[PDB]
């Protein structure tokens, strides 16, 4: 019922990112971090494959291991780029746990990436101008 | 301290231009070097524009290198990234 | 926060989507028309180009005004092809929008398209298989 | 015949490529015409694909032109309009 509604916004918010607009805040940190993403894929190869390879999700990963990984990517602080490449490692995660026929291991990612956001992230990205000061910054 | 980052640097084009173009030359010293400060989001990358003699089978001829140095992310034992962006004579 | 999960869904699906994945069947849905829409407007560049003039928007412009203009794309057969050019024409009117500094306007917009959808299409939507027949169309 | 929609395309064809690069080429004759089917989603587009005859200075040449005909989208009920594709000599 929402169905239609939907794909109308997101059409929108693609069509009005092409020309530099955008739909609203969210959808401008969303291509913010779409594009930078991207850009550290290419620009850091070498360094987000050794990320990558430090850890493989299977059906008896638990959150401790992500948090573990991460906790070492953020251990001389929190920056934005640092930010970009634990969004980065979790795409690759994901796409790694489909590429094995186990897409029911894409839910637990997406939690696991949620948590670490709100538990750890959200106060440095609060106390440096939200993700406002990301967009002007990419 | 300096100075010898500045000859790694050095090498490592040479080593490097000689993988490519499956060449055979002979580094020997760095007679100029300076450096440019890039960013990327909030991470510093840096530019290294070298000036080295090397024996071209046997022939001392100088060369322009460019290099360029991306921190590291994960602590690698081999520091920062390089990557030799151009190597031609003068 | 609800905000961060949408970043994560969001850059998910998108990581997804370059591999040939999907977040859901939804976001399959999204990709299609959003590759559709660009297929659409690069290679019927005229006549798209033409379309888009039919309505000159402001903030006077009402819905039936819009429902006409529409009325007129499928008035002889709705097809797959019919809708993607309907999504583009709603995305141009946007940025026209956005272009004259009337932002407010985009809202306004969607919530015509939506409309247009849930009254007009949705019949022939259904009839034809639904999102996920024009899907399996658009994938070979 | 059929050929006299095939000669109508490669004449569009000329026509067009002399509007396109300011040129003054004048049509001769079809020496070879294709076609092939192609599909837009529920979309019926067919390329034409032409070897024509015509004269550039007076000196009679060879030239393959590609033409689209598709769909024409609003108003007139099941129209078609033309394109060319491409335009090049032999």
């Known amino acids: 019922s929402q169905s239609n509604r939907e794909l109308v916004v997101d059409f929108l918010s693609y069509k009005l990112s092409q020309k530099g607009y955008s739909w609203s805040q969210m959808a401008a940190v969303k291509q913010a971090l779409r594009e930078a993403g991207d850009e550290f894929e290419l620009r850091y190869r070498r360094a987000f494959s050794d990320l990558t390879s430090q850890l493989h999700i299977t059906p008896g990963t638990a959150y401790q291991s992500f948090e573990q990984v991460v906790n070492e990517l953020f251990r001389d602080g929190v920056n934005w780029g640092r930010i970009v490449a634990f969004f980065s490692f979790g795409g690759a995660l994901c796409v790694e746990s489909v590429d094995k026929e186990m897409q029911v291991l894409v839910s637990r990612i997406a939690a696991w990436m949620a948590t670490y956001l709100n538990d750890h992230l959200e106060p440095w990205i609060q106390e440096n101008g939200g993700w406002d000061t990301f967009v002007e910054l990419y | ?90």
């Open chain 2, 1 to 90: 301290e300096n100075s010898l980052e500045i000859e790694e640097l050095a090498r490592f084009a040479v080593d490097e231009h000689n993988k490519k173009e499956n060449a055979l030359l002979e580094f020997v010293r760095v007679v100029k070097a300076k450096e440019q400060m890039f960013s990327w989001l909030d991470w510093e990358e840096t530019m290294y524009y070298l000036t080295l003699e090397a024996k071209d089978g046997g022939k001392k001829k100088l060369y322009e290198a460019k290099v360029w140095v991306k921190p590291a992310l994960l602590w690698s034992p081999h520091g920062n990234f390089k990557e030799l962006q151009e190597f031609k004579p003068v």
